[PDB]
Amino acid sequence: ALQLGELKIAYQLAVEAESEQKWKQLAELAISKCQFSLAQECLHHAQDYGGLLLLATASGNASMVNKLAEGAERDGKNNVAFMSYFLQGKLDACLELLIRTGRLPEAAFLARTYLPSQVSRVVKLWRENLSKVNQKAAESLADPTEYENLFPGLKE
Amino acid sequence: HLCEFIEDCEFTVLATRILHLLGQEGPKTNNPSKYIRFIYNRVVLEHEEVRAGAVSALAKFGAQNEEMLPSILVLLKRCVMDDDNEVRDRATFYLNVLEQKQKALNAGYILNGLTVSIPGLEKALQQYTLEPS
Amino acid sequence: MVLLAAAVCTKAGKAIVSRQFVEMTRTRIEGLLAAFPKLMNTGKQHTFVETESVRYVYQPMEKLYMVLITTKNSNILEDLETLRLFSRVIPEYCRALEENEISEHCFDLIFAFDEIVALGYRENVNLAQIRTFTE
Amino acid sequence: RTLDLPIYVTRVKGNNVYCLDRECRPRVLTIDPTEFKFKLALINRKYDEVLHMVRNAKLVGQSIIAYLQKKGYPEVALHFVKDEKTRFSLALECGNIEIALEAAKALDDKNCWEKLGEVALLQGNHQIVEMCYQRTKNFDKLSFLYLITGNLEKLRKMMKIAEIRKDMSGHYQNALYLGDVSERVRILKNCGQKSLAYLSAATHGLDEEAESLKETFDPEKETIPDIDPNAKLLQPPAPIMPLDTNWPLLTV
Amino acid sequence: MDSEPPSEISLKNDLEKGDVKSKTEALKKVIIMILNGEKLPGLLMTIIRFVLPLQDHTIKKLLLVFWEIVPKTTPDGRLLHEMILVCDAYRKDLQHPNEFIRGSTLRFLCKLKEAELLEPLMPAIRACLEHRHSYVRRNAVLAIYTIYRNFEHLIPDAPELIHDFLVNEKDASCKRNAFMMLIHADQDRALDYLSTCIDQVQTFGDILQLVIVELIYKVCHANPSERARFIRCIYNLLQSSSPAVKYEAAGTLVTLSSAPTAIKAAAQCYIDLIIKESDNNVKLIVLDRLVELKEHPAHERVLQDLVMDILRVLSTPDLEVRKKTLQLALDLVSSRNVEELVIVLKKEVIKTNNVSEHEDTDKYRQLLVRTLHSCSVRFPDMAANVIPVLMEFLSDSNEAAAADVLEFVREAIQRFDNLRMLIVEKMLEVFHAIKSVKIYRGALWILGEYCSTKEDIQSVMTEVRRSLGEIPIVESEIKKEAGELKPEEEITVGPVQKLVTEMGTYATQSALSSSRPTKKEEDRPPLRGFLLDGDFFVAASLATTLTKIALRYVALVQEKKKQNSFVAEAMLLMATILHLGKSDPVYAEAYVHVNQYDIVLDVLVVNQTSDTLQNCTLELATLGDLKLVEKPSPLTLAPHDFANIKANVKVASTENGIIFGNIVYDVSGAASDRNCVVLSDIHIDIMDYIQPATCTDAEFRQMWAEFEWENKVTVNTNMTDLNDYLQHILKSTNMKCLTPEKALSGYCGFMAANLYARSIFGEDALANVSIEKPVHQGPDAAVTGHIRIRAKSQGMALSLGDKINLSQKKTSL
């Protein structure tokens, strides 16, 4: 079915639930023919979060890119995750990926960027995290005194 | 403590003694968990009569003390204390009576959890002749 | 080097005669040969046996081991072939292996070792070739 | 002090301690102001007293030159910092990693630069993180960080030096993060990922670049995937004028 | 002179003597003592003096020999110069008409990476530029390469001298004999030239071309060298599902297991794999290719199955090959393992058919019945096959032979409810001749459960009930059993009710019925009569009685997970169980410091005294398994010197003959009676010497059995679990907490660790740490743990016993 170039027949033969090895071979074949459509479905069934994202995050509306990177957020596959959510000026779960991983500073930083002034809460949670994670001279528990700066220090 | 000795060369009999005694007393003098852990290993590699002994004892142990029932279940599901041969048959009975049934029977059955017979004190006469032979 | 040393051993617990192509395995040579060749190089009557992360190739002759050692390797056929050529050369010098006669012809054997394996690369030798040197 | 024989203390009466063994040969020993003065001084937070106190009858390795790197709010730590490791340690315990990078440098090691860079992001400032992360070669982590940080100039630098690595979750990121996607289109072209390059480009309305990729490679751009292939991509990149590489700080 | 390190005075004498033989022998004796590693510089002037110019090869060859193994070290007769006594008159040696002396000289000279001989080795290529043998040309390419290696990576070594300076490697390719010392870093033109040479090869030389440049477009072109590379290249061009059918790999492979059965067993494995790639369920593992030897046409002559029959084994070839073979029958053909295991078991298990498969040892017979029977429990189809074969097992009609047979089949009935009705009548038959427990037990159970089906029972049971043999365990089994199934469906002179009467008497009561039972007094102490006595609510009838129990199976019973099963074929299993699968005053002060992961014992050496201690040296010693990684090296301990001196420490070594105490540290000084003193730095223990090793549950269990561990102590501060103090401390007495021996629940749940080590003490060390952490209203002693310990003569047992309490040291100088 791959040889014939019968994508559909190869697709039934894989069978939508699992047989990921079949689907990865099919997904590549689908990208070759530049039939992106069959490819997105093959990659989904394959799973292939890293690869699947690359085809998928080319959306500009993030239409089917969040799912295949939902995990990535909290797996420390943050990079895969950021591309998914930030793609049309939206913060879909951009911030959230950063909180999940423990890369709290980065959520604060993002919050400042697009300023809905969410920063005040993120900086706090983060600052608290510095005090627990042995910093005393950059301890952060202040509003601008102990290193980092909560939202009134910050600005648009 | 004595059971700490040797896992399966200690014989059917010692395992049967710690097992019978731990079943029957239902230790609150020491935690039964050491006893159970010691007996559990011995059963695997020792004779049928003790492994069969161990399931039935456990059942009586259940009926006398409520607390005990959780250990009975981990032990009996195992391929050892049940599902060997003789051990299975006795177990199927003993288990089913504890698990399934009223335990009118189980309750009745434990009167302390005593031995199968009460003879005299055999050792001392035996010993008298046996020593200067 | 690919070939650490080419060594004749007695399983008395010592390297009877041995060759260090370039200064590396001096004293090291004796300890390896002494422990491993005693156990048949830890073999089972197999020409290749590897122990303590050193490849030992051998042939038993009496209470003695003729031993080739490597810890790296370029080809299968080659390691045996230098040992083999060595085994044509060794009875010419010592009439089989035997510790006292091996001991007496340290010079003979040692010279052959340098000639046979040069800077760990297995050159070839022959009993006539050996003659020009000891002449 | 050590004597040259095994012994039993006879007892302590006075400064001396007196000893006798089984055979009963004596040893006496004056209780010194060596080890005793040094730590009597360190306990009462004196470092100035303690420098004199440092002698080679009591220096050891870790009671003076590295035991004094054992405060989570550095005090003792500040005083002995001579080891490149003790210096590294000192820095995370403050939370100011400016010293870390140098110790990390002098430890000649990448791992330290990425870990201090992470601590750096924690004190809040990403300039310091960039430098570290750049030399550990985590251009892709940086690429990810960078819109989060709100830089666009720095974000481009990462894209190129991650292009060459073919880090598809590095080079790939930045194009999304700026309002136009063109960065990806070329990187992907070089990857040979013509499909991916077209989809990305096309959606932003850079159909012309998308077409270039199709024409150079296998065409067919018409196909509509489970994602859009031509719907607007535009994002307003970072509304902040001062970025989070320029995250404010005072530091205590 | 095998190895005699003091003999250097005699060698000097022997080295010049006016007799050439003596000189040769002497120089030879020097060589053999250096090679072992012993004293040699005293001699040097003597050695060097006779031999130097001469074309007489033997002494020259001998001296040439000694210059590649120690030239640098020896300096009495040589000293340091550019044209040393290694090469000054060996320019003559290089330029002699006899090829041997020149060749030899060239060969050692260029071999050295020496910089005090760099110039003399360079035009030393002259000696072999003319090639009187294959040896001369090979000697030359290797010597130019060795010159290139020795600091001449540039223009001193690269072009030609008059024919080679790094160009023999080019020349060799087109010359009659090849050999390319060009493996790395050398002329591109020669590399290219070797490729051309693949065709015009010289076979030894081809192995040299080939280490450098491999992969051919061809099949070959000839010779072992090309051939050896070729199988590597073939595996590339078809990686897919192993090699399957081994290529030129086959030749070396046999020798790889010359000891002797293991080769066949291995070979059998590959041959089975190769046949087919099946489903690959539990023990159906055959990989390789699906079709390449098929299985099972009906027109194939004389068929595939003939080879398949070998694999079904009783031992039909020898035991190593047997274990491999049984697995291999299972692997090509079954459903999982079950199908082919039943066939295989039918052959193995005891019958009246063949007496080469029956035996009067009861356990093996029994086990074989259980193996056959487990297949049914696994898979249904097998139930139908098993029951008639089981009846054949019975037909042996020895007391014991019946007995084993009855015992499994009765378990099968618990699984297989009113399906095996048919068997009961067969099963009774041999129950009458009786000398054992087992027959009574089993028979009474079949005949008991099966009562509806038959009606014989007073007659069958009664001969046995009044017969003797051994009857302990008989009681237990008859007690739960005799009444069962249908309330009044038998009768011979005792209906099912007589049976319930009997069943009760046999359990522990008394009653005239079946001419009284053999015994009444039950088996092992816990079992007793009473449960069942209470029972039989509804007289032997499927309801909620003995019958229920009998026609039901205790817990889950499926597969070969050992739930009414036994896991394949009984003989193969013994081998699998066996497989453990084990994986002058002196003062010191000191502390241990770690900076940048360097572990060092800091020592400060103090002279509080005014007296002289000059002659001061500092050493850290190797005691046994403790070792110095570098002693403290300062010459300190002088009048009123305070010094910090660092002695690096290791924990792992090999036993030295000196004392085995704490740490020995040695300072030396002035004094002539006690020039060396031993004085101490802080504590290190005997425990270090133990070596950590680990066990799995099987190795632990085996060792438990192997040697006693009755010895116990209770150790305080084992309040905590295995993971915390106990692991850390156990680690320091080189032990490790591995697998469990616990049995946790709501009443059970002492933490159990199985420990192992293999001490350098001639013992292992094992222990079980039981942590008595309350999971009951009456704990042992509350929190604390009792460690049951051993070692192989329990001399390290004790170390485990106390090094799991506490352990800490610190100082702050």
PDB file of N, CA and C in Angstrom, chain A residues 105-106 109 138 146-149, chain D residues 95 117-129 243-251:
ATOM      1  N   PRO A 105      10.131  31.374  36.868  1.00  0.00           N
ATOM      2  CA  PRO A 105      10.640  32.697  36.399  1.00  0.00           C
ATOM      3  C   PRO A 105      10.240  33.092  35.083  1.00  0.00           C
ATOM      4  N   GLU A 106      10.215  32.119  34.177  1.00  0.00           N
ATOM      5  CA  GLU A 106       9.813  32.204  32.792  1.00  0.00           C
ATOM      6  C   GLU A 106       8.319  32.457  32.743  1.00  0.00           C
ATOM      7  N   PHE A 109       8.009  36.068  33.477  1.00  0.00           N
ATOM      8  CA  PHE A 109       8.500  36.837  32.428  1.00  0.00           C
ATOM      9  C   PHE A 109       7.583  36.994  31.308  1.00  0.00           C
ATOM     10  N   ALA A 138      19.258  36.832  47.571  1.00  0.00           N
ATOM     11  CA  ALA A 138      18.546  37.123  46.345  1.00  0.00           C
ATOM     12  C   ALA A 138      17.270  36.416  46.600  1.00  0.00           C
ATOM     13  N   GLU A 146      14.564  42.174  47.274  1.00  0.00           N
ATOM     14  CA  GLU A 146      15.363  40.976  47.275  1.00  0.00           C
ATOM     15  C   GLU A 146      15.314  40.323  45.925  1.00  0.00           C
ATOM     16  N   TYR A 147      16.356  40.663  45.069  1.00  0.00           N
ATOM     17  CA  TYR A 147      16.464  40.503  43.651  1.00  0.00           C
ATOM     18  C   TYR A 147      15.145  40.851  42.965  1.00  0.00           C
ATOM     19  N   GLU A 148      14.570  39.866  42.242  1.00  0.00           N
ATOM     20  CA  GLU A 148      13.399  39.915  41.399  1.00  0.00           C
ATOM     21  C   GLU A 148      12.321  40.888  41.795  1.00  0.00           C
ATOM     22  N   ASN A 149      11.466  41.200  40.805  1.00  0.00           N
ATOM     23  CA  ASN A 149      10.582  42.331  40.902  1.00  0.00           C
ATOM     24  C   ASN A 149       9.245  41.904  40.491  1.00  0.00           C
TER      25      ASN A 149
ATOM     26  N   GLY D  95      22.252  32.951  45.901  1.00  0.00           N
ATOM     27  CA  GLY D  95      21.363  33.179  44.833  1.00  0.00           C
ATOM     28  C   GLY D  95      21.814  34.164  43.816  1.00  0.00           C
ATOM     29  N   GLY D 117      22.957  29.177  35.260  1.00  0.00           N
ATOM     30  CA  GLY D 117      22.086  29.954  34.410  1.00  0.00           C
ATOM     31  C   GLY D 117      20.659  29.757  34.875  1.00  0.00           C
ATOM     32  N   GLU D 118      20.298  28.485  35.236  1.00  0.00           N
ATOM     33  CA  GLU D 118      18.892  28.270  35.722  1.00  0.00           C
ATOM     34  C   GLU D 118      18.578  28.997  36.963  1.00  0.00           C
ATOM     35  N   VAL D 119      19.536  29.032  37.941  1.00  0.00           N
ATOM     36  CA  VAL D 119      19.494  29.787  39.242  1.00  0.00           C
ATOM     37  C   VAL D 119      19.331  31.262  38.913  1.00  0.00           C
ATOM     38  N   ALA D 120      20.033  31.716  37.788  1.00  0.00           N
ATOM     39  CA  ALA D 120      20.023  33.076  37.320  1.00  0.00           C
ATOM     40  C   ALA D 120      18.622  33.513  36.918  1.00  0.00           C
ATOM     41  N   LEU D 121      17.951  32.617  36.121  1.00  0.00           N
ATOM     42  CA  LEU D 121      16.604  32.867  35.803  1.00  0.00           C
ATOM     43  C   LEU D 121      15.697  32.989  36.942  1.00  0.00           C
ATOM     44  N   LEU D 122      15.934  32.210  37.989  1.00  0.00           N
ATOM     45  CA  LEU D 122      15.373  32.338  39.301  1.00  0.00           C
ATOM     46  C   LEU D 122      15.664  33.692  39.984  1.00  0.00           C
ATOM     47  N   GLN D 123      16.871  34.338  39.934  1.00  0.00           N
ATOM     48  CA  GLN D 123      16.978  35.618  40.624  1.00  0.00           C
ATOM     49  C   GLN D 123      16.229  36.685  39.904  1.00  0.00           C
ATOM     50  N   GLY D 124      16.026  36.537  38.611  1.00  0.00           N
ATOM     51  CA  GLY D 124      15.234  37.258  37.659  1.00  0.00           C
ATOM     52  C   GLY D 124      16.149  38.251  36.975  1.00  0.00           C
ATOM     53  N   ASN D 125      16.409  37.880  35.735  1.00  0.00           N
ATOM     54  CA  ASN D 125      17.240  38.538  34.791  1.00  0.00           C
ATOM     55  C   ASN D 125      17.639  37.458  33.849  1.00  0.00           C
ATOM     56  N   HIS D 126      17.503  37.676  32.563  1.00  0.00           N
ATOM     57  CA  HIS D 126      17.785  36.696  31.608  1.00  0.00           C
ATOM     58  C   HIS D 126      19.050  36.988  30.762  1.00  0.00           C
ATOM     59  N   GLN D 127      19.736  38.166  30.893  1.00  0.00           N
ATOM     60  CA  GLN D 127      20.946  38.526  30.196  1.00  0.00           C
ATOM     61  C   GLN D 127      21.948  37.465  30.589  1.00  0.00           C
ATOM     62  N   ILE D 128      22.077  37.197  31.922  1.00  0.00           N
ATOM     63  CA  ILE D 128      23.082  36.355  32.606  1.00  0.00           C
ATOM     64  C   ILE D 128      22.882  34.915  32.224  1.00  0.00           C
ATOM     65  N   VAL D 129      21.537  34.496  32.159  1.00  0.00           N
ATOM     66  CA  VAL D 129      21.077  33.222  31.694  1.00  0.00           C
ATOM     67  C   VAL D 129      21.528  32.997  30.261  1.00  0.00           C
ATOM     68  N   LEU D 243      12.449  44.499  28.297  1.00  0.00           N
ATOM     69  CA  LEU D 243      12.473  43.081  28.304  1.00  0.00           C
ATOM     70  C   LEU D 243      12.933  42.578  29.603  1.00  0.00           C
ATOM     71  N   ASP D 244      12.870  41.284  29.673  1.00  0.00           N
ATOM     72  CA  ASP D 244      13.050  40.587  30.896  1.00  0.00           C
ATOM     73  C   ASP D 244      14.454  40.005  30.984  1.00  0.00           C
ATOM     74  N   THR D 245      15.385  40.520  30.107  1.00  0.00           N
ATOM     75  CA  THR D 245      16.798  40.348  30.127  1.00  0.00           C
ATOM     76  C   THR D 245      17.294  41.470  30.909  1.00  0.00           C
ATOM     77  N   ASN D 246      16.339  42.412  31.111  1.00  0.00           N
ATOM     78  CA  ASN D 246      16.444  43.730  31.706  1.00  0.00           C
ATOM     79  C   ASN D 246      15.379  43.754  32.798  1.00  0.00           C
ATOM     80  N   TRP D 247      14.990  42.532  33.225  1.00  0.00           N
ATOM     81  CA  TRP D 247      14.186  42.289  34.437  1.00  0.00           C
ATOM     82  C   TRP D 247      14.743  43.079  35.552  1.00  0.00           C
ATOM     83  N   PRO D 248      14.062  43.902  36.304  1.00  0.00           N
ATOM     84  CA  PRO D 248      14.657  44.762  37.332  1.00  0.00           C
ATOM     85  C   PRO D 248      15.007  43.999  38.532  1.00  0.00           C
ATOM     86  N   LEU D 249      15.965  44.555  39.237  1.00  0.00           N
ATOM     87  CA  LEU D 249      16.656  43.917  40.404  1.00  0.00           C
ATOM     88  C   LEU D 249      17.365  44.923  41.196  1.00  0.00           C
ATOM     89  N   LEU D 250      17.539  44.630  42.472  1.00  0.00           N
ATOM     90  CA  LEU D 250      18.154  45.422  43.443  1.00  0.00           C
ATOM     91  C   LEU D 250      19.204  44.656  44.177  1.00  0.00           C
ATOM     92  N   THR D 251      18.774  43.391  44.489  1.00  0.00           N
ATOM     93  CA  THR D 251      19.607  42.348  45.041  1.00  0.00           C
ATOM     94  C   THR D 251      19.879  42.642  46.495  1.00  0.00           C
TER      95      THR D 251
END
